[PDB]
Symmetry: D2
């Protein structure tokens, strides 16, 4: 009751209200509610890291086999210029350009690239999916994992899935 | 054929400094942890402590050693310092090919119906942070029963 | 041309105060560049291997290249370690130069800024490496160079 | 009786193998005296080792006198042959080389190790090194600057020393 800082906390209800993507030469926004109830693939990467650039071929093959999983780029670029040139050469959504070490701390991400597969209720279906997707042996078994894994509904703070996923 | 019908009909273990065998049908309907390793590889020997802590946390998962020892005597000395089950001493590169196993140790978590629950579990179980995530995977993954060729889940799991 | 301004001091904690050292102290020394962060548990567990490395190679100066998110996290790291550190800043440009893609990473650098061991973090986790590294140090001819951190981190 | 068997190892690894014209050829191991070597631990059934060949070809272009030797972990002679025909590397004869993995604690395929003429390890984890563009000038400096102190190999057999603890 004393020293209630709900007022301060409430700013976070609009955290990550948009993701970004390229269409022709436009950096466009998409309302993050679009990702409600979707499986996500979180791609931790940077345009300056050659391994992350070669990894895009594996992600593109993954996307062809798992078209309903949405790929979200979590950038570790140095400038907007680097971020924008990379995003325009991909079919991915992205977090806005920013410093995301706090997400690395939450999931103990220690390598670029890293790729994690996330269920609609923000559980981790595959922690180390970057390794998983560089051969093609994974496809049938990942389809079984997605088909068979029960999704128990959760309540996200402020009804904000990305606040839950990246902060809580 | 004939030894298709008898492929992997027993797994092996040590007890009281004696090599023993168990009907492999005992592993029907069990979660398995396939431990790819070798006694010559120091990273595999230290990994035994992570597996033992894993087993304490997940006691219904059966740990099966898939050996890459050079000699039967090295295999035996390794198996006697563990309480794991093991495939018979043999050359298992065909299993490495099937699953694209490229590192020792590797550890794969398998459901009762031979699906892969966690492909790269060695790195998962050396941390502190995996228990609740793995508990949820096991509790949430629906098991549809399967019948296996030659009535032998290891024929399916290792040879298709 | 304030390249003269670049990396004039490294930092460290001693007697619970933040101190600085002129970067010319590191001229002609073997260096161990430790890319790390206090938020990364694997970097924190790696400090024990670095301390054992330092006991066996006391003349190699370990330099911490930070990837902490905040200045307070960086200071807490310095208070708990015995390395010299770059000032708190964003060092992705060094990661790009050397294609550092993992934390921790550890690189061993000769007095004239050549790379003696590119991927030394896995090397020093064991203690199998010690004789091999002693031979590399003993046998690597040094051709002296006039300048060191602008050459090492930018070129 | 078998102190004579121990002497047999003076002829250990007397030939390496390679393919030139879909044709299997042998080369006297003495060709490799005083050479730097790149030991490539790999297997044709391992997709990561197949993709690694691209990095080894860039390495061979930039370091043509570092002789690449394939240490096989193929299941069958035919897998070994097909791999060798497509990479025209030198190779140990098809066999089981777990004892080499024990000596050097090789735990990943592919692995690649750079060896000096006196059998010291110049770069232990060279598979990681050569996947980047950046390594070339500093590896040339490392080869140019590392002093080679002469050693005596048992039976004057370099590969016996390099592979057999």
């Amino acid at each position: 009751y004393p020293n209630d800082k709900t007022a301060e906390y409430e700013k976070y209800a609009n955290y990550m209200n948009y993701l970004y993507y390229y269409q022709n030469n436009e950096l466009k926004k998409i309302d993050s509610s679009y990702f409600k109830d979707k499986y996500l693939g979180l791609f931790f990467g940077a345009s300056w890291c050659k391994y992350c650039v070669t990894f895009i071929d594996s992600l593109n093959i993954f996307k062809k086999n798992f078209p309903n999983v949405e790929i979200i780029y979590i950038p570790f670029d140095r400038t907007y210029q680097e971020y924008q040139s990379f995003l325009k050469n991909t079919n991915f959504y992205a977090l806005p350009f920013d410093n995301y070490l706090y997400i690395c701390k939450k999931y103990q991400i220690k390598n670029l690239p890293s790729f994690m597969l996330i269920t609609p209720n923000n559980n981790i279906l595959v922690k180390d999916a970057a390794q998983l997707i560089k051969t093609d042996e994974y496809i049938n078994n990942l389809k079984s994992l997605i088909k068979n894994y029960i999704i128990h509904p959760k309540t996200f703070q402020f009804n904000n899935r990305f606040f839950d996923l990246f902060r809580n």
